[PDB]
Structure 1
Amino acid sequence: LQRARTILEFEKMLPEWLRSRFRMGELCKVAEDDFRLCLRINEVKWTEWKTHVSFLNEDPGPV
């Protein structure tokens, strides 16, 4: 929490051009004509197996 306060106070100081390049997330197409900025996080889950029916890309892995 204290560390988070330090990060944001630094972040409020940066200029506009330097704020843009360190912008977070990548632009993804989550639906039809719905381009949003999102955050990629990987997970590994072993317990409740299932058939993966809902997804965005059938070719897994990066790129």
Structure 2
Amino acid sequence: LQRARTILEFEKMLPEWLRSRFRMGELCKVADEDFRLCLRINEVKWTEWKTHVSFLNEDPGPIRR
């Protein structure tokens, strides 16, 4: 919490144009018009062995190219 207490204050005393792009930006949603909302990528492990209905892509690890 205390290092979290610090880190925002540095950003608060950073009025630049925010070059530190901390995120995947404007990565498209499933909604056909809503291709907005910057996102995140994370990793999960072995549980709940099943078929997966919902997906977004043709399963690469990073983005293509």
Q: Indicate whether the TM-score tops 0.5.
A: yes
Return the alpha-carbon distance in structure 2 between the equivalents of residues 13 and 4 of structure 1: 15
For residues 22-55 of structure 1, give each alpha carbon's deviation from its aligned partner in whole angstroms, at most 9, with x where no partner exists: 5675533342111233442332321211111101
Structure 1: runs of 5 or more not aligned: none
Matched length = 63
**RMSD over aligned Cα atoms:** 2.6
- 8 A Cα contact 1:27 1:35, kept in partner: yes
Return the alpha-carbon distance in structure 2 between the equivalents of residues 61 and 23 of structure 1: 17
Aligned-pair identity in percent equals 95
Structure 2: runs of 5 or more not aligned: none
**Off by >2 Å, runs of 4+ in structure 1:** 18-31, 35-42
Normalization by structure 1: what TM-score? 0.66
Higher helix share: 1
Higher strand share: 1
Stretch of structure 1 that moved more, 17-26 or 45-54: 17-26
